[PDB]
């Protein structure tokens, strides 16, 4: 059992532990949100149990870390006093003060290809290949990359991550071999973090912490792709077979 | 069923989105920082077109009243992609000072000097409409299809207002290419990974390319996917994007049409 | 009648020393009892942490603390007693139930009279509560808008679990709106003007280990010998709005539990499963200067010599847990610089303690902006120990305790930087990107030092960072700075700010 997920595309954010204005990101995926990914294609209504979620293992291989952009956001300036955001006396704000000026941060340039291995993910990349509502990656304006899904079954994928899976283009010397790369496992642990989705209630959303240990690997760099466009490439080539 | 639809529009000299600062917003994507619209802002002016042609579909197709408390429906099903740039895009710094008109025993002690950042693009912009949903949720089948049809309308025609009087932004897309697929929506804002080279234009080099990933992605997945596009070119074919049409507003006739 | 009580009601998070796999919750007397067998117990919100965190060191702590150095060298003979229980490596349950046995049934916050951490009276005098949503932390208040955390208009709100009530009091017992809270009238008197929190907008420093009995040990900071001192639920009778909050030279004095500047009272449901509604308001009118520094904050001193807590900074969590790379080290919290070193006693135990933040950045007034938690990684010091030798890991501790250095210094010396070019530049908003794009790029340089794989501006094996960070800052610094460099009078600004972080 298992499959390939390829998180990519322009912009993605995976937000934990912000509960105002501001927003900020984990540098790598979070199972919550991954999580609520497969809910949302398997149509699990806001609310709905999460334990056939549970029991899923996500190892997920960073190629290119990305970069980390804040953007800007606000809500509700430049409208007349009486349509912009209501207060919860319900008694609309001034108009100078009725913008709300959110800071939400999301990686950009950043590319992990998770193998989420569980007892029932098959069928959960069969429900990501035809959705009940649109997967995104982390806030909904970020749209997926088309090879959302690499492989829809594989036997073991985590020997799949460490060879046979095309890379982004980076540094490789002469006489080199065996780019580095850094796969993510969930004593040796990195960081404890909320991850675990004990409910999606948008009126109580509660989770868990889940230990992570990012360990550097070391992958034969015949896996990274040539300078320009030849990663396109590779990971079509790669697709089909 | 999933209705997407992909635009090339460019834009002349303008700051339709800015910063806290006065810089637009940019992704640093491919490697090449490029300039963006953000998601928001587009889709606060196409919903407000919306809703003013239409005289709750905007609580449907667009998920909840800014204004108005949440009625267990805040989702809008439609998905807007933030727009940006085919290419990578230096911004471009415009000196300027106001001229205090009350002159003094001395000349051109000038009223403000300041300088405020524009840049100009040919931008990617795509969307998604979950019709399945939409139906289920708004009932009639009739005024969604209204509905639907005339949100596609508004993604075309309109353009943000920011700073467009300074610069008149206002233009029309390129190509148009609606894809009613059944499997899932996909974005073709891999087609830009690799930002393209300059000094020869990119509105045709970007529809050529966007017709190669349209190619390679139809042969690795065949689909029953329903395709048409129009484009402002007739020079140049694109096979991969489906039948093309004569003009935007029968393009989006056919799909609509395609979709029921 | 409602009633629920910390020591046996479960609101405690616990996680064993085993399996690491389905904590379960428990009371305040359990968690005390079973120390030895969990490693840790966790709350979610950072501001309860924070201050439960301050109330479990005076319970297990002060009955293990004793409140009393009397002669015989006192910070001698208390790291005596100290070393004594560390070894014994458990506290006896009996000793336990006997602190509780002295105020047991003074613990269950819905009491009649005497409810925990509350002032029971306040019902009577206070005409509009203040409502659940506006104690509750992430839930918006009479004026906030509804966009975030779930949307609350303020009617019909939905009452908070009584566990999770126990959460938010205590936070805003510690951090707490300043300004404009619900009048109460005491004798004629009507202020809805309230003072903000005492540890507001800060980030309190507490240091851990493998099981909890060790945190609760190490965590209490050394009392001076002075009055004898009692906590706010130790007080014999309510403290009254008006006169003075009086001094207290005892550790409860110095845990900042004496008295709250806020003061809450939650009304129960029948049931007592939750909080219905809940008024906040001030206890005290004027405010008093607390003695001595609280151990957990750093402190900074600024020009005209004026001594405060160093703010949280949401750009520094941007960076996951960088703050409890702390003990890697100038200033330094005194709890840390008692307990963490080897002037101390315990003899092997410093080995294994790993460091814990709690940091709520916020304005000092009602706005607020981010809280993080922040456990040191075990990766750094594991590292040390895979190869098991006195050199090439004191060379590893060495570099990563260098890497962290370079760390900080260039981000203070990129933040006057920034803070510097901008204000010269117009005659700041520079300083908020430049800090989060410093913090991005030099954690993944910082991550290559350690493990010396190759990162710009630095050789694998070199004696210390070797100019790794200054390059980070310096591209930060140039990412920001970047457009405002075109015009010659503010690119002469910018150059000669950019020069100070050439190092």
Redesign the interface.
Same mark, same amino acid.
């Given at each position: 059992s298992g499959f390939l997920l390829r998180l990519?595309?322009?912009?993605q954010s995976w937000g934990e532990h912000s509960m105002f204005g501001e927003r900020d990101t984990l540098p790598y995926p979070s199972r919550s949100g991954l999580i609520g990914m497969f809910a949302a294609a398997q149509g699990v209504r806001r609310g709905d149990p999460l334990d056939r979620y549970k029991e899923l293992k996500f190892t997920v291989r960073v190629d290119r870390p990305g970069?980390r952009?804040v953007?800007?956001?606000t809500?509700?300036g430049g409208?007349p006093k009486?349509?912009?955001?209501?207060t919860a006396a319900g008694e609309?704000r001034d108009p100078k003060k009725a913008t709300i000026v959110t800071?939400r941060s999301y990686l950009?340039?950043a590319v992990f290809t998770v193998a989420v291995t569980g007892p029932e993910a098959d069928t959960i990349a069969d429900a990501?290949?035809?959705?009940?509502?649109?997967?995104?990656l982390g806030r909904?304006?970020?749209?997926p990359?088309?090879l959302?899904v690499l492989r829809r079954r594989v036997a073991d994928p985590v020997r799949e991550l460490v060879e046979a899976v095309p890379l982004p283009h980076r540094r490789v010397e002469e006489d080199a071999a065996t780019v580095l790369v850094d796969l993510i496992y969930e004593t040796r642990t990195l960081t404890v973090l909320n991850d675990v989705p004990l409910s999606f209630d948008?009126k109580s959303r509660r989770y868990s912490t889940r230990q992570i240990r990012v360990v550097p690997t070391e992958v034969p760099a015949t896996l990274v792709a040539g300078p320009?466009?030849d990663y396109?490439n590779k990971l079509?080539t790669y697709?089909?077979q | 069923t999933?209705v997407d639809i992909h635009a090339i529009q460019t834009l002349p000299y303008s700051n339709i989105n800015r910063?806290?600062?006065g810089?637009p917003?940019t992704?640093?994507?491919?490697?090449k920082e490029r300039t963006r619209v953000?998601?928001?802002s587009w889709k606060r002016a196409v919903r407000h077109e919306v809703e003013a042609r239409l005289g709750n579909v905007s609580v449907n197709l667009f998920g909840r009243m800014?204004?108005?408390?949440?009625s267990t429906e805040?989702?809008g %099903?439609v *998905?807007?992609?933030?727009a940006?740039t085919v290419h990578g895009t230096t911004?471009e710094?415009d000196?300027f000072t106001a001229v205090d008109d009350i002159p003094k025993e001395n000349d051109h002690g000038s009223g403000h000097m300041n %300088?405020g *950042?524009f840049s100009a693009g040919t931008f990617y912009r795509?969307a998604?409409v979950?019709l399945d949903?939409l139906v289920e949720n708004t009932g009639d089948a009739q005024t969604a299809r209204t509905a639907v049809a005339e949100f596609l309308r508004a993604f075309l025609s309109t353009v943000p207002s920011g700073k467009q009087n300074a610069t008149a932004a206002m233009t029309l897309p390129d190509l148009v290419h609606i894809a009613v697929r059944?499997?899932?929506?996909?974005?073709?804002?891999?087609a830009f990974?690799?930002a393209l080279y300059g000094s020869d234009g990119y509105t045709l080099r970007a529809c050529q390319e966007l017709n190669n990933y349209a190619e390679?992605?139809r042969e690795?997945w065949p689909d029953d996917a329903i395709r048409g596009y129009a484009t402002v070119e007739n020079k140049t074919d694109l096979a991969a994007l489906g039948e093309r049409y004569d003009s935007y507003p029968a393009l989006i006739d056919a799909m609509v049409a395609a979709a029921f | 009648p409602p009633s629920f009580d910390v020591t046996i009601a479960p609101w405690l998070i616990a996680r064993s020393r085993d399996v690491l796999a389905a904590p379960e919750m428990l009371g305040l007397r359990d968690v005390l009892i079973r120390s030895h067998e969990l490693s840790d117990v966790e709350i979610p919100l950072p501001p309860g942490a924070a201050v439960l965190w301050r109330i479990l060191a005076l319970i297990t702590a002060r009955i293990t603390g004793l409140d009393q150095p009397p002669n015989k060298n006192p910070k001698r003979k208390w790291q005596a007693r100290r070393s004594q229980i560390l070894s014994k490596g458990r506290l006896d349950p009996e000793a336990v139930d006997a602190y509780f046995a002295d105020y047991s049934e003074r613990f269950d916050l819905f009491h009649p009279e005497r409810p925990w951490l509350q002032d029971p009276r306040l019902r009577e005098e206070c005409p509009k509560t203040s409502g659940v949503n506006k104690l509750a932390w992430g839930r918006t208040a009479g004026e906030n808008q509804?966009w975030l955390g779930g949307?609350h208009?303020d009617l019909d709100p939905h009452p908070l679990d009584s566990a999770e009530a126990v959460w938010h009091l205590l936070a805003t017992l510690g951090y707490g709106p300043s300004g404009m809270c619900t009048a109460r009238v005491v004798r004629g008197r009507s202020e809805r003007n309230v003072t903000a929190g005492p540890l507001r907008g800060t980030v309190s420093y507490h240091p851990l280990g493998r099981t909890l009995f060790e945190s609760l040990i190490l965590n209490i900071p050394y009392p001076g010998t002075g009055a004898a001192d009692l906590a706010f639920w130790e007080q014999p009778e309510l403290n009254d709005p008006l006169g003075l909050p009086e001094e207290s030279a005892g550790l409860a004095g110095i845990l900042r539990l004496d008295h709250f500047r806020h003061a809450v009272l939650l009304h129960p449901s029948p049931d007592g499963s939750h909080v219905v509604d809940a008024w906040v308001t001030w206890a005290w009118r004027e405010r008093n200067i607390s003695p001595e520094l609280d151990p957990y904050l750093i402190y900074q001193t600024s020009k005209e010599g004026r001594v405060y807590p160093r703010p949280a900074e949401a750009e520094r969590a941007i960076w996951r847990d960088l703050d409890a790379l702390l003990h890697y080290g100038n200033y330094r919290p005194t709890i840390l610089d008692n307990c963490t070193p080897l002037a101390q006693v315990p003899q092997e135990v410093l080995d294994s303690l790993r460091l814990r933040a709690f940091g709520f950045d916020q304005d000092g007034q009602a706005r607020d902006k981010q809280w993080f938690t922040a456990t040191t990684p075990a990766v750094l010091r594991w590292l040390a120990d895979r190869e098991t030798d006195d050199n090439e890991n004191a060379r590893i501790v060495r570099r990563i305790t260098l890497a962290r250095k370079a760390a900080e210094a260039l981000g203070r010396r990129l933040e006057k930087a920034c803070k510097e070019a901008w204000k010269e530049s117009n005659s700041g908003?520079w300083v908020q990107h430049g800090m989060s794009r410093y913090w991005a790029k030099a954690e993944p340089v910082f991550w290559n030092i350690v493990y010396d794989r190759p990162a710009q501006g630095y050789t694998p094996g070199m004696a210390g960072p070797g100019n790794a960070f200054n390059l980070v800052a310096l591209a930060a610094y140039d990412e920001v700075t970047g457009?405002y460099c075109?015009?010659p009078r503010v690119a002469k600004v910018v150059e000669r700010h950019r020069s100070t972080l050439f190092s």
């Open positions: 990519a595309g322009p912009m970069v952009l953007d800007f956001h809500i509700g409208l009486e349509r912009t955001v209501p609309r800071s950009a340039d990501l290949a035809a959705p009940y509502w649109q997967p995104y909904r304006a970020f749209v990359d088309p959302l948008s320009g466009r396109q079509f697709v089909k | 999933f910063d806290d600062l810089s917003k992704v640093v994507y491919g490697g953000s998601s928001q800014l204004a108005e408390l949440p805040v989702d %099903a *998905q807007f992609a933030h940006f911004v710094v000196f %300088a *950042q795509y998604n979950n949903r059944f499997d899932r929506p996909i974005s073709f804002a891999p990974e690799t390679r992605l690795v | 509804v949307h208009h908003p457009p075109e015009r």
